[PDB]
Design an enzyme around this catalytic site. Structure first.
Site, short mmCIF file in Angstrom:
data_model
loop_
_atom_site.label_atom_id
_atom_site.label_comp_id
_atom_site.label_asym_id
_atom_site.label_seq_id
_atom_site.Cartn_x
_atom_site.Cartn_y
_atom_site.Cartn_z
CE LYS A 77 0.59 -8.93 -3.72
NZ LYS A 77 -0.14 -8.48 -4.94
CE1 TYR B 111 -1.20 -8.98 0.12
CE2 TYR B 111 -3.58 -8.75 0.32
CZ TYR B 111 -2.30 -8.31 0.62
OH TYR B 111 -2.13 -7.19 1.40
CG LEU C 242 2.82 -0.86 3.92
CD1 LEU C 242 3.70 -0.76 2.69
CD2 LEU C 242 2.54 0.51 4.54
N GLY C 243 -0.75 -3.80 4.39
CA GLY C 243 -1.95 -4.54 4.04
C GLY C 243 -1.86 -6.01 4.36
CD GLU C 244 -1.90 -8.91 8.61
OE1 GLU C 244 -0.84 -9.30 9.16
OE2 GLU C 244 -2.96 -8.68 9.25
N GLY C 245 -4.29 -9.72 3.70
CA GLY C 245 -5.39 -10.39 3.02
C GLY C 245 -5.10 -11.83 2.68
CG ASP D 39 -9.56 -5.83 -8.62
OD1 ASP D 39 -9.08 -6.28 -7.56
OD2 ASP D 39 -10.77 -5.46 -8.75
CD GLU E 199 2.86 -10.48 6.57
OE1 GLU E 199 2.50 -11.57 7.06
OE2 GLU E 199 3.46 -9.60 7.22
N1 LIG Z 1 -3.78 -4.23 -3.13
C1 LIG Z 1 -3.61 -5.13 -1.95
C2 LIG Z 1 -2.23 -5.77 -1.98
N2 LIG Z 1 -1.18 -4.80 -2.22
C3 LIG Z 1 -0.34 -4.92 -3.30
O1 LIG Z 1 -0.40 -5.80 -4.15
C4 LIG Z 1 0.68 -3.86 -3.45
C5 LIG Z 1 1.43 -3.88 -4.60
N3 LIG Z 1 2.41 -3.00 -4.90
C6 LIG Z 1 2.60 -2.04 -3.98
C7 LIG Z 1 1.91 -1.94 -2.79
C8 LIG Z 1 2.18 -0.78 -1.95
C9 LIG Z 1 3.12 0.22 -2.14
N4 LIG Z 1 3.04 1.28 -1.28
C10 LIG Z 1 2.04 1.14 -0.44
N5 LIG Z 1 1.76 2.10 0.48
C11 LIG Z 1 0.74 2.07 1.43
C12 LIG Z 1 0.74 3.11 2.34
C13 LIG Z 1 -0.21 3.20 3.35
N6 LIG Z 1 -0.24 4.29 4.26
C14 LIG Z 1 -1.19 4.17 5.38
C15 LIG Z 1 -0.44 3.74 6.62
O2 LIG Z 1 0.67 4.62 6.83
C16 LIG Z 1 1.64 4.49 5.78
C17 LIG Z 1 1.03 4.99 4.48
C18 LIG Z 1 -1.17 2.20 3.39
C19 LIG Z 1 -1.12 1.20 2.44
N7 LIG Z 1 -0.20 1.12 1.47
S1 LIG Z 1 1.16 -0.34 -0.64
C20 LIG Z 1 0.92 -2.87 -2.51
#
Ligand SMILES: NCCNC(=O)c1cncc(-c2cnc(Nc3cc(N4CCOCC4)ccn3)s2)c1
EC number: 2.7.11.1
Length: 272
Positions: A37, A19, A14-17, A122, A21
């Site tokens: 997370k 912090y 969902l995300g990489e940085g 933020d 992943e």
């Molecule tokens: N803010 C950066 C670090 N993240 C967190 O701390 C952090 C903290 N609490 C919750 C979260 C998430 C919960 N649901 C998420 N869904 C999601 C769907 C995506 N979509 C795009 C790709 O297809 C699937 C749907 C793309 C990206 N994210 S992120 C992240």
């Protein structure tokens, strides 16, 4: 009691940085989705502590955590609609009714957080998530802090946030109230939703776009793309003096905030 119910398959990044992943986890038995997370401790204690306090429809729910040595796993509410960031068309924004609905939901989440004495620090479209029904959820409490404890307010002094979203007092003053800082970043998010453009790199007098705003040059971008009613609200939010800045109870009384624009969700209907 049911075997395998504790097993989760990590299916997508969902995300990489810096912090660590964020992975989309799917339960082996139920197929329930959660966001996991993964933080490489080689701040997280504060994030978990803050997460344990949160229970609101516009705030990402926390399910619990597990430590496997130097790696923490945070089980969080999965938001299938992704980031608000991806709903903002560059240089355009989005339909005003959608921006108003997201803004109402963002204010609901922020009122809640401030109510329990938590400041996010933020707020930006990358951290505002959307569920399967396009409901906004505030996420990522990695920079969050408690600004009120035992009914006593603590003035903040740490430089936290993201420059285009940060309030001017954080750049000019040694100490500042937490709440007007989150209000300001919400005003910048509203600007981005309505114009698909950020107004300045940072709120400093050295920044021409910022000086232009203080001089009321609203015939310039991004302001010229924004209707007079939301623009009047932005004039009250993006006020340099945080003591003069509009508060959330007053944002709830704003004309644009209360303007009927958006039809309810697409419900099934038949004729004759
Ligand atoms: N803010 C950066 C670090 N993240 C967190 O701390 C952090 C903290 N609490 C919750 C979260 C998430 C919960 N649901 C998420 N869904 C999601 C769907 C995506 N979509 C795009 C790709 O297809 C699937 C749907 C793309 C990206 N994210 S992120 C992240």
């Amino acid at each position: 009691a049911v075997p395998f119910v504790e097993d989760w398959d990590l299916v997508q990044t969902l995300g990489e940085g810096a912090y660590g992943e964020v992975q989309l986890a799917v339960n082996r038995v139920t197929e329930e989705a959660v966001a996991v997370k993964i933080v490489d401790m080689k701040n997280i204690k504060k994030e978990i502590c803050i997460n344990k306090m949160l229970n609101h429809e516009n705030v990402v729910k926390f399910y619990g955590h597990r430590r496997e040595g130097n790696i923490q796993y945070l089980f969080l509410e999965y938001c299938s609609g992704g980031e608000l960031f991806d709903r903002i068309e560059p240089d355009i924004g989005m339909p005003e009714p959608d921006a108003q609905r997201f803004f109402h939901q963002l204010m609901a989440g922020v009122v809640y957080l401030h109510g329990i004495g938590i400041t996010h620090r933020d707020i930006k479209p990358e951290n505002l998530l959307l569920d399967e029904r396009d409901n906004l959820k505030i996420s990522d409490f990695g920079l969050a802090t408690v600004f009120r404890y035992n009914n006593r307010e603590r003035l903040l002094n740490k430089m936290c946030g993201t420059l285009p979203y940060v309030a001017p007092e954080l750049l000019k003053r040694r100490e500042f109230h937490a709440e007007p800082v989150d209000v300001w970043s919400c005003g910048i998010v509203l600007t981005a939703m309505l114009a698909g453009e950020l107004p300045w790199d940072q709120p400093s007098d050295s920044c021409q776009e910022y000086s232009d705003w203080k001089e009321k040059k609203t015939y310039l971008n991004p302001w010229k793309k924004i209707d007079s009613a939301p623009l009047a609200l932005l004039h009250k939010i993006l006020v340099e003096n945080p003591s003069a800045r509009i508060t959330i109870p007053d944002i709830k009384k704003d004309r644009w905030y209360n303007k009927p624009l958006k039809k309810g969700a697409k419900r099934p209907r038949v004729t004759s």
